[PDB]
Design a binder for these strands. Structure first.
Lengths: 75, 478, 57, 144, 60, 145, 209, 72, 151, 60, 74, 202
RNA sequence: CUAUAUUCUUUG
């Protein structure tokens, strides 16, 4: 490992206090959850409703909460 | 009134494509309809012609050795072809530089050659320049050929290998061709080895201009103009892009009013500032109109009178200019009949913000003397293509040009800078489609900040009024 | 044929697991399509140019 | 200058077997003419022509729909190459999409265009190759 | 619990991969002793991320 | 200067100068705005060939027909679209061209320009308006039979 | 050394200029092409190469049903005929715009449909397959010995309830080469990755579950 | 010997240069200067000889203010 | 020392990325042939195109050789396949240049005099031809520096 | 060479069309051609390069 | 909140004091002879650009909590 | 016939020789003879030849070089590379707008129309022919909000002008700011706020 | 490894 140089004194993928590392929430997961019948379409969907409906686990939750990613969804 | 920020209406549509695209569209829609009229060059062109010979000239420059990265330098005096070159250099994405010819020597020519380092030099042999005899402006035919051979002495020493040596001048090594433009009235064409091929199909399988145009982006700067009052030491030639020009033209054409085949005049010698270079011809292109050139120059009484005698024939329903050459029209308009001006309805004068405030009694004088319905005054810094705010004769209020935000901020921020108190001098930031944040320099193409909020630094300090009014200043020197 | 990597490219091991990356049965020149002109104007002589040699043979 | 006339005009070959879409009299006449002619021309001469607006008026005045020239392929490839992130072309794993392991000693293998998929390609001996086709019709790389 | 993830690895490398195949990648040192005189190609063969040798990867 | 020379053909029937383009060598190129209305067609050759009777013993006809066949081969008509070409007769398909660059209209009305009188005899003015082997004719003049 | 040549002159589409005079005392592109000091620039340096674009991946949260995989199910000598592929996909976009649509069969961009029932009546399927509590179909792709991170994978099918051996006897037809094992709660298919999972799901959806 | 050819257009771009034995020879009292590609400007510029260990942008590296003939 | 070898089988198709031969600096043993590029410092042979590599030996001195890469692979493939098939059917002739035992004779019966054409030294007056030939254009090339015959 | 997948990527390379690379006789005495004489020609120095590369030419 | 409250400075505030919640002094001009000397030196240090009036320190943190986007789609 | 030097010798040298070393006779030289080029001896026109005769700089794997020369120099390199990547991304997205809009016969509009891209994704055989729109359908307006007009609904707040459907926010941010890191520099790079700074505890 | 080099480049 000493043959390899150091880079970026903190380290490449390094956490620091206040790096925004989001856990992903795929839009497909959400739409599946809505069309499956976990969640109200009628209602503003907060992170709270996601946790309560069980669609996201406690372990997944960390600061900052989530990112909405569109994975395999064209409409 | 409370704070220094100004915004125009956003309902006006914005054109984001390349220039060639709108040229093709406008060529398909109105093909046979007139585009520009010039009597002194015998040029009557349709949109057919402008498309056809624009891309033809593009191919001409491609075979003359021009490439999408490099620059062109153009000293042409009020021709049609400098506009054609705008379009051609737009199609191949080469930066065109237009420099004013009214004071030109060998020294500043070689300065331009040092600065832009152009591939091409678009020049003349005999050019018409104003000079002072007996306190009176008289035309001189400056022999520009002498100037070129003074700047580059090595073209005279001719050994019988030297059309083909790699560098024509060891001291300008980026010069490859010089395009001489003079109207030689001989009917015989020139020999094809000094003439570039402008006609016919340039290809077999597909033309390479639309293979290239996919690789060009609408914000690629192509044009450069002088700033006679530079914001800073650094900003020499402020630089324009596709959508800057297109949207300047469209905003002007939308704001005044322009309907197809209506006639639209330009006072000469405005091709070096964004009046006849940018606003006018693109206004004529974008909406259907007919651009009209009056006499090739302005600065003398004789061809001022010839100017009136032409514009009254050409049936121009409205024309553009600046105060200083409307002075000459005001001198010599009294000598003619009133009803001769019956077709002129509106007129436009453009203002750099360091002028400040052409007086409304002067506008009243124009309107009463020419029998005008309305006189329109546009004002803005030269980065903004001479339009930020505008007023009419009947409306003294300064209305903002749509899609324009002018703010005056503090010095402690970039994006997060705060609006001042509406009388206080602070930095000026302009956000608009027709505004340019690039400027060309000795160093090369340069850019000042375009931030997260979308605003853009001008490196100028300004004072906002309670009623919409901008006053530019030099930098604060305590 | 000695050496370490020649042992890896014969027993085709973990850099060479698919050895020669240019191997028979691919041709870059024709892409395995026959160059024959069926495009003939009159449909009678369609098979007129056939057996035009691709090389000396 | 009719429609079906134009269709038969655009699809013409000389000694054709059957011709559909045209009225019968014209078909019979063409049959006569092509029975008369030999397959071999006595003189051949050809010119070349560039597009102009008379094409448009030809298609629009007759209420037809003008054909367009498709965009270039290699320009699309160039744009698709220069558009992607620098981290799209780096090495993403121990195994190249072929299934071969890339040991770091060789610079040819420091680039990866297509992402490797370890959990795909187990079904290819049992399946038709038409499954391998990508979104644009180019076969994607599977681990074998 | 994390005792063995030592930071001298975390400064040098970074792991990249899809599940069940992941490289650890590093940059090259030849650099900060002699740059000049060698050649530009052999110098900028140093700016690429590269997978570590598999023994070392297994070992770490 | 055998290595430095602007390309000169002897048979421009393909009008290659429109297609194979070589840069003007001269450092000062002269480009007016007038030359946009100049049609750039190749110069009139000597030995106008379309007057030739296609006699089998005639040398100019021999060299012309071998030229035409080679032109047919380089544009890949001869092997490909049209496998067997017997060259018997000397053919000229001529068009009533006005040499006008783009499509025009009438200034007096706004009509399309009327169909020109069909050409009676071939002239030198008519020469590039024919169909040659390989050349280029504008679309604007091909509008009529 | 007189540096000159006809190279600087742009020649478009074929160079007809005399070729003995091209570059004079200047290195040609061929001279730098045979002389480069690097070696073997990588296969990904080819810019114009037409690279594949993957289709939309089948995930557990996205059922993107491919028609060709389904056709490779339809070629098999299976019993228990399947719903035609048009029915496994949800109703269309422009048909579903207004309030005129039913509640069970609603438009879903992910695509999710409640089980359609058997494609043929008057016939009894020996097994019955349960969806998960979240609507997911039972196949799970594990790895044999995940600690060493082995690429070797398998497929575990749990929620089968019925005669499981009929399930396996059709699963043989789906997977002729692979290894199948039976246990009270589950059915193992060996050396089958997400591909076979996609298939199992196409077959179970087509079967009416 | 090891010297640094640093841009005369002051971008602080330097390029390591090894003097030829003639230039290694003390025969002449001059700093070497050479036309090279300056990537920072994307242009060709003059480079000057300067010591490799030292700040490549020094204060003394400021050009005096030159008014340009062009424009008003 | 190090062992410097072939990285491909000669007579087998090869991609551009793969090395052909690693030489040792001594004129090199192997010189670049058609569609082959040599690293000037390393003397390592690379393939320009993608095709079949074959070895030429110089007719002058058999120990000095060229590596060639022939661009179309399937030509070589079906030529070799047919050739082999014939070999098994006893229908092939052993007189082709592919036969290494025969190539001497093959070069001999085609051009018998290639010895005396190689040994023939031109004088300076025909090596250096009077340039006005080149100026007037009687000859189109003037190349004083090819005095040596490489075949 | 730095491809686009590097860590650092540089600016545009010099356009080939300007300031070419001369084919110079190698000054290395082992790589120098035998007949190449050390060029002593006693000459008045012509300081501009335009004429000074004409001396290297025979076009008459 | 940004487009209503935050992006506007204090109504009294001068350009130099713009960022402060309340202007520390009345007059915008630097109110200390030492501070004035320093501002003069700053305006001749950096050449005379518009923003040079306000002192910005020559040295940096290189810390991640002050850094913003280098370049990206707006 | 043949000559002992092979070319007919010009009179200048001749009369110069038999009036020993004197050129006063013909000094005005005739122009050189032409070499005619056979136009049918040329190869058939090739497509790739048409592709590369222009010699564009975009086929380099180092990056979009043409992009660099069309871009300002005022930006630190590591922030400029990811800038030029953004313009070469927009040229791609626009290339795709062109393609899909041409594929459905619709006049061009760009971010993208949805219904065009998605429905053209439903046909593999739609790649054959493209049709132009009629001249009536052709308009200058390439944004959807300029084209589609108003539709009834909007969600984002009305009090903010930045959320206006026709509002124009510039396409890319341009910052003159330098980049903070390079590999050959030892202590450089962006540090955690409570990490020790560069050269702390000297 | 630590210091001097702080843009695409550089020392022991």
């Amino acid at each position: 490992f000493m043959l390899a140089p150091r880079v970026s004194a903190g380290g490449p993928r390094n956490r620091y206090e206040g790096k925004l590392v989001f856990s992903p929430l795929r839009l497909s997961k959400l739409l599946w959850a809505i069309d499956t019948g976990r969640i109200n379409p009628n209602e503003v969907i907060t992170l709270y409703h996601l946790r309560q409906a069980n669609v996201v686990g406690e372990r997944e939750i960390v600061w900052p909460g989530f990112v909405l990613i569109s994975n395999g969804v064209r409409r | 009134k409370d704070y220094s920020v100004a915004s125009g209406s956003v309902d006006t549509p914005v054109l984001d494509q390349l220039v060639g695209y709108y040229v093709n569209i406008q060529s398909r829609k109105m093909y046979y309809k007139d585009f520009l009229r010039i009597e002194h060059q015998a040029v009557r062109w349709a949109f057919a012609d402008i498309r056809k010979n624009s891309e033809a000239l593009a191919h001409g420059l491609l075979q003359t050795g021009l490439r999408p990265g490099q620059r062109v330098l153009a000293i042409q005096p009020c021709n049609c072809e400098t506009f054609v070159l705008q379009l051609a250099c737009a199609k191949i994405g080469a930066l065109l530089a237009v420099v004013p010819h009214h004071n030109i020597s060998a020294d500043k020519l070689r300065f331009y050659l040092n600065e832009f380092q152009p591939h091409h030099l678009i020049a003349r042999e005999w050019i018409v320049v104003p000079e002072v005899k007996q306190g009176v402006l008289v035309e001189r035919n400056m022999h520009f050929w002498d100037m070129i051979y003074n700047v580059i002495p090595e073209l005279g020493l001719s050994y019988p290998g030297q059309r083909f040596q790699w560098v024509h001048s060891q001291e300008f090594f980026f010069l490859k061709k010089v395009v001489i433009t003079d109207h030689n009235m001989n009917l015989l064409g020139v020999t094809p080895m000094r003439k570039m091929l402008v006609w016919g199909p340039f290809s077999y399988y597909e033309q390479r201009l639309r293979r290239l145009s996919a690789l060009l982006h609408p914000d690629d700067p192509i044009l450069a103009l002088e700033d006679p009052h530079p914001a800073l030491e650094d900003k020499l030639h402020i630089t324009y892009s596709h959508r800057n020009c297109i949207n300047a033209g469209f905003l002007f054409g939308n704001l005044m009013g322009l309907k197809a085949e209506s006639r639209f005049g330009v006072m000469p010698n405005h091709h070096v500032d964004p009046v006849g270079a940018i606003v006018a011809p693109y206004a004529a292109l974008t909406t259907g109109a007919v651009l009209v050139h009056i006499h090739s120059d302005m600065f003398t009484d004789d061809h001022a009178i010839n100017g009136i005698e032409k514009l009254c024939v050409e049936e121009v329903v409205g024309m553009l200019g600046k105060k200083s050459d409307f002075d000459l029209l005001l001198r010599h308009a009294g000598n003619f009949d009133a009803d001769q001006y019956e077709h002129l309805k509106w007129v436009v004068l453009f203002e750099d913000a360091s002028e400040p405030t052409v007086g409304d009694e002067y506008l009243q004088k124009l309107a009463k003397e020419l029998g005008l319905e309305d006189v329109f005054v546009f004002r803005g810094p030269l980065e903004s293509a001479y339009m930020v705010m505008w007023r009419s004769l009947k409306r003294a209020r300064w209305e903002m040009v749509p899609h324009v935000e002018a703010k005056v901020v503090g010095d402690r921020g970039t994006a997060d800078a705060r609006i001042l108190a509406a009388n206080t001098r602070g930095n000026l930031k302009l956000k608009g489609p027709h505004i340019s944040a690039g400027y060309y320099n000795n160093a090369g193409l340069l850019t000042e900040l375009v931030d997260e909020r979308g605003f853009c630094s001008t490196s100028r300090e300004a004072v906002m009024d309670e009623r919409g009014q901008l006053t530019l200043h030099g930098t604060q020197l305590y | 044929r000695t050496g370490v990597e020649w042992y890896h490219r014969l027993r085709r091991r973990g850099a060479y697991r698919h050895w020669p990356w240019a191997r028979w049965n691919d041709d870059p020149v024709r892409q395995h399509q026959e160059l024959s002109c069926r495009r003939t104007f009159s449909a009678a002589v369609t098979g007129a140019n056939e057996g035009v040699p691709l090389w000396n043979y | 200058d009719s429609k079906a006339s134009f269709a038969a005009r655009a699809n013409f070959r000389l000694h054709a077997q059957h011709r559909d879409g045209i009225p019968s009299s014209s078909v019979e006449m063409l049959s006569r003419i092509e029975q008369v002619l030999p397959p071999d021309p006595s003189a051949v001469t050809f010119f070349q022509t560039k597009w102009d607006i008379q094409v448009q008026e030809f298609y629009e005045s007759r209420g037809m729909l003008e054909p367009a020239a498709p965009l270039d392929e290699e320009i699309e490839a160039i744009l698709a190459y220069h558009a992607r992130k620098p981290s799209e072309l780096r090495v993403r794993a121990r195994h190249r999409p072929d299934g071969s392991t890339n040991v770091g000693d060789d610079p040819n293998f420091w680039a990866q265009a297509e992402p490797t998929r370890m959990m795909d390609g187990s079904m290819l001996s049992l399946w038709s190759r038409r499954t391998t086709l990508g979104a644009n019709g180019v076969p994607i790389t599977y681990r074998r | 619990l994390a005792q063995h993830r030592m930071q001298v690895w975390q400064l040098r490398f970074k792991e990249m991969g899809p599940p069940f195949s992941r490289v650890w990648v590093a940059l090259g040192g030849k650099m900060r002793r002699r740059r000049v005189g060698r050649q530009v190609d052999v110098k900028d063969m140093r700016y690429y991320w590269r997978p570590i040798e598999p023994q070392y990867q297994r070992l770490y | 200067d055998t290595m430095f020379q602007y390309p000169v053909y002897e048979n421009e029937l393909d009008t290659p100068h429109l297609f194979n383009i070589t840069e003007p060598p001269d450092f000062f190129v002269y480009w007016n705005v007038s030359d946009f209305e100049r049609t750039s067609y190749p110069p009139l050759p000597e030995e106008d060939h379309r007057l030739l009777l296609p006699l089998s013993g005639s040398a100019p006809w021999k060299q012309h027909r071998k030229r035409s066949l080679k032109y047919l081969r380089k544009h890949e008509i001869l092997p490909n679209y049209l496998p067997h070409v017997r060259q018997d007769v000397n053919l000229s398909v001529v068009f009533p061209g006005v040499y006008a660059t783009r499509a025009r209209l009438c200034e007096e009305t706004g009509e399309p320009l009327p169909p020109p009188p069909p050409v009676s005899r071939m002239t030198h003015r008519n020469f590039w308006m024919t169909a040659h082997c390989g050349n280029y004719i504008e679309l604007a003049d091909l509008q009529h039979p | 050394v007189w540096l000159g040549g006809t190279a600087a002159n742009t020649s478009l589409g074929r160079d007809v200029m005399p070729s003995t005079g091209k570059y004079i005392n200047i290195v040609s592109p061929t001279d730098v092409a045979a002389n480069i000091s690097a070696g073997a620039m990588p296969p990904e340096a080819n810019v114009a190469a037409a690279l594949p674009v993957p289709r939309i991946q089948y995930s557990k949260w996205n059922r993107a049903l491919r028609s060709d995989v389904y056709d490779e199910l339809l070629k098999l000598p299976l019993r228990y005929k399947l719903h035609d592929f048009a029915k496994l996909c949800p109703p269309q976009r422009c048909q579903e715009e207004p309030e005129a649509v039913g509640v069970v069969g609603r438009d879903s961009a992910v695509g999710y449909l409640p089980p359609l029932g058997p494609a043929d009546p008057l016939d009894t399927i020996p097994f019955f397959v349960h969806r998960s509590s979240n609507g997911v179909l039972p196949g799970k792709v594990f790895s044999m010995h995940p600690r060493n991170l082995m690429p070797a994978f398998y497929l575990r099918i749990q929620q089968v309830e019925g005669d499981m051996f009929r399930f396996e006897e059709e699963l043989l037809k789906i997977f002729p080469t692979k290894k199948i094992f039976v246990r009270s709660h589950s059915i193992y298919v060996y050396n089958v990755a997400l591909d076979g999972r996609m298939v199992l799901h196409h077959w179970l959806l087509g079967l009416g579950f | 010997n090891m010297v640094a050819l640093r841009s005369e257009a002051n971008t602080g771009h330097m390029e390591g240069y090894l003097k030829t034995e003639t230039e290694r020879l003390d025969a002449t009292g001059r700093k070497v200067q050479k036309v090279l590609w300056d990537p920072v400007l994307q242009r060709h510029c003059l480079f000057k000889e300067t010591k490799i260990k030292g700040p490549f942008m020094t204060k003394s590296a400021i050009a005096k203010k030159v008014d340009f003939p062009i424009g008003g | 020392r190090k062992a410097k070898l072939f990285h491909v089988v000669p007579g087998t198709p090869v991609t551009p990325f793969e090395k052909l031969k690693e030489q040792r600096r001594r004129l090199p043993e192997y010189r670049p042939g058609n569609n082959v590029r040599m690293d000037p410092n390393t003397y390592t042979l690379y393939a320009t195109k993608k095709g079949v590599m074959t070895i030429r030996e110089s007719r002058i001195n058999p120990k000095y050789k060229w590596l060639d890469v022939e661009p179309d692979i399937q030509k070589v493939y079906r030529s070799r396949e047919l050739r082999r098939a014939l070999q098994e059917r006893e229908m092939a002739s052993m007189a082709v240049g592919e036969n290494s035992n025969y190539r001497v004779e093959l070069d001999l019966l085609l051009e018998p005099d290639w010895r005396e054409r190689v040994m023939h030294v031109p004088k300076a007056t025909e090596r250096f031809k009077d340039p006005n030939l080149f100026t007037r254009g009687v000859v189109n090339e003037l190349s004083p520096l090819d005095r040596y015959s490489y075949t | 060479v730095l491809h686009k997948w590097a860590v650092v990527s540089r600016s545009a390379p010099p356009p080939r069309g300007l300031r070419p690379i001369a084919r110079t006789i190698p000054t290395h005495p082992r790589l120098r051609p035998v007949d190449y004489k050390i060029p002593y020609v006693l000459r008045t120095f012509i300081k501009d390069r335009h004429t000074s590369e004409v001396q290297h030419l025979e076009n008459r | 909140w940004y487009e209503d409250s935050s992006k506007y400075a204090h109504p009294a505030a001068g350009r130099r004091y713009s960022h402060y919640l309340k202007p520390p002094t009345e007059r915008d001009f630097p109110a200390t002879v030492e501070e004035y000397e320093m501002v003069k030196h700053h305006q001749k240090w950096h050449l005379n650009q518009p923003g040079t009036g306000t002192l910005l320190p020559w040295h940096s943190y290189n810390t991640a909590d002050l850094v913003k986007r280098a370049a990206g789609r707006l | 016939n043949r000559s002992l030097l092979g070319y007919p010798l010009r009179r200048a040298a001749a009369m110069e020789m038999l009036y020993g070393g004197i050129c006063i006779q013909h000094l005005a030289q005739p122009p050189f003879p032409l070499r005619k080029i056979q136009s049918e001896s040329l190869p058939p026109p090739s497509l790739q030849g048409e592709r590369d005769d222009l010699e564009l700089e975009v086929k380099d794997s180092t990056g979009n070089v043409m992009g660099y020369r069309l871009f300002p120099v005022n930006i630190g390199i590591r922030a400029r590379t990811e800038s030029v990547r953004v313009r070469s991304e927009d040229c791609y997205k626009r290339f795709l707008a062109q393609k899909h809009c041409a594929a459905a016969g619709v006049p061009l509009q760009f971010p993208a129309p949805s219904s065009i891209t998605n429905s053209n994704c439903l046909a593999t055989p739609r790649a054959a022919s493209h049709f132009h729109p009629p001249s009536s359908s052709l308009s200058l307006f390439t944004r959807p909000a300029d084209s589609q007009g108003g539709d009834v609904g909007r969600t984002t707040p009305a009090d903010v002008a930045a959320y206006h459907p026709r509002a124009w926010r510039p396409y890319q941010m341009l910052k003159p700011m330098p980049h903070n890191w390079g590999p050959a520099v030892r202590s450089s790079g962006v540090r955690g706020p409570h990490m020790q700074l560069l050269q702390e505890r000297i």
